[PDB]
């Protein structure tokens, strides 16, 4: 005997968890995020881009696409904690976003369907945009903080 013997060994049978009292409720998105708003992206590949808000998803992310023919941003998920909602809104009463769900962005080069349905939504968006002056050039241009610019003072 290098070590004598512990007489009591614990019951290595694992216990069940207590019945958790918290069910998932639908997200309270801030009033400033209305489908059709132009969002300044804050992080990722497309940080400091201008993007167009299209749909709220099941995953509490935003289905957005700054039309690929303005800023090279495809139909994408974006987190709402990484956007600054501008006070400028494009009319989105001519786009079928009902196609897109969470399994659409299952990861599992680019798929032919994904490129064509990008072009379908892009046609409707760019038709709505070209009405308002300078808004394609705005959406084309990227965002950056300059000197004298104080985020807390800057309205959007």
């Amino acid at each position: 005997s290098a070590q004598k013997a512990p007489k009591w060994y614990p019951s290595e049978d694992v216990a069940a968890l207590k019945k958790t009292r918290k069910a998932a409720r639908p997200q309270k998105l801030r009033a400033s995020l209305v489908p059709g708003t132009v969002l300044i992206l804050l992080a990722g590949r497309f940080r400091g881009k201008r993007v167009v808000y299209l749909k709220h998803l099941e995953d509490n992310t935003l289905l957005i696409s700054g039309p690929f023919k303005v800023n090279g941003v495809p139909l994408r998920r974006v987190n709402a904690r990484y956007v600054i909602a501008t006070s400028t809104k494009v009319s989105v009463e001519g786009v079928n976003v009902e196609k897109f769900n969470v399994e659409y962005f299952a990861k599992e080069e680019i798929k032919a369907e994904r490129v064509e349905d990008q072009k379908v939504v892009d046609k409707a968006l760019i038709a709505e945009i070209k009405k308002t002056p300078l808004l394609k050039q705005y959406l084309s241009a990227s965002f950056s903080l300059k000197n004298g610019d104080k985020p807390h003072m800057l309205k959007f």
Partner: protein
């Protein structure tokens, strides 16, 4: 074109200290262009990072990042308190940090 900025320029002033004793867990950060606690309350809960350059490529790049978040305001004159994932090293008193516009409003 020239500008690429998507953070505010913070500076590591000091730690939370007494007249003598210091608390290296809470680091005091001065944000550029903030005056009062009212102006500072925009930046409450934001993500501050300290970007610095070592000489050894660790996992792709020689640049390393020490992450934190703004906890609350400090004093009367718009200073904030920041807590970092790992505390700051103190040799960075006067070094710049980046105050990102993460969790947004």
């Amino acid at each position: 074109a020239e500008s690429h900025r998507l953070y505010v320029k913070g500076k590591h002033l000091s730690y939370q200290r007494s007249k003598r004793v210091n608390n290296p867990n809470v680091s005091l950060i001065k944000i550029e262009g903030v005056a009062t606690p009212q102006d500072a309350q925009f930046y409450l809960g934001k993500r501050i990072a300290y970007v610095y350059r070592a000489s050894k490529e660790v996992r792709g790049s020689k640049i390393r990042v020490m992450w934190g978040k703004v906890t609350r305001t400090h004093g009367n004159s718009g200073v904030v308190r920041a807590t970092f994932r790992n505390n700051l090293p103190a040799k960075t008193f006067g070094a710049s940090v980046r105050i990102f516009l993460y969790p947004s409003n």
